Amino acid sequence: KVFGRCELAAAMKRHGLDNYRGYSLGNWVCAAKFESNFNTQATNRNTDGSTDYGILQINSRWWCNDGRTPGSRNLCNIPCSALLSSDITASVNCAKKIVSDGNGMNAWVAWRNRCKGTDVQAWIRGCRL
Numbered sequence: 784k785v786f787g788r789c790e791l792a793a794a795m796k797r798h799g800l801d802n803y804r805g806y807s808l809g810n811w812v813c814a815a816k817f818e819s820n821f822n823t824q825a826t827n828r829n830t831d832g833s834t835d836y837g838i839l840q841i842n843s844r845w846w847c848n849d850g851r852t853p854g855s856r857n858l859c860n861i862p863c864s865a866l867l868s869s870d871i872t873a874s875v876n877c878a879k880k881i882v883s884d885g886n887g888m889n890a891w892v893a894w895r896n897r898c899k900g901t902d903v904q905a906w907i908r909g910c911r912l
């Protein structure tokens with residue numbers, strides 16, 4: 784599923800990401816834009832051979848099982864394929880574990896490089912939330 788910007792903002796808010804560990808909703812929308820272009824089916828191979836899955840490009844090195852990432856963990860206890868669903872529940876619940884891991888949203892290198900320190904509120908501008 785390719786979400787609309789305000790559609791994804793709405794879905795992330797319902798799932799409790801707005802100010803989760805102090806990250807305002809615009810931070811999550813901005814991260815999703817640059818990670819997936821709001822596409823739940825987005826997959827990208829990392830240089831270490833792991834893969835990033837779904838709207839928030841959650842990596843098989845630590846968070847999900849894809850059966851092909853040697854020496855990896857599955858800390859969200861989920862097949863990586865569950866992160867590609869039109870239903871963002873598994874992506875959001877896993878993201879809550881990631882952002883609680885100590886480094887906050889710096890876990891998402893695209894958030895650090897493209898959203899952090901920017902006017903992220905722009906990402907929810909015009910949205911009925």
Ligand SMILES: [Cl-]
Nearest residue numbers: 787788816821
């Ligand atoms: Cl957009």
Ligand SMILES: [Cl-]
Nearest residue numbers: 807808809904
């Ligand atoms: Cl915001």
Ligand SMILES: [Cl-]
Nearest residue numbers: 823837838866
């Ligand atoms: Cl997703």
Ligand SMILES: [Cl-]
Nearest residue numbers: 850851852853
């Ligand atoms: Cl594996």
Ligand SMILES: [Cl-]
Nearest residue numbers: 852853854855
């Ligand atoms: Cl392994």
Ligand SMILES: [Cl-]
Nearest residue numbers: 794870871872
């Ligand atoms: Cl959803």
Ligand SMILES: [Cl-]
Nearest residue numbers: 892893896897
């Ligand atoms: Cl980046």
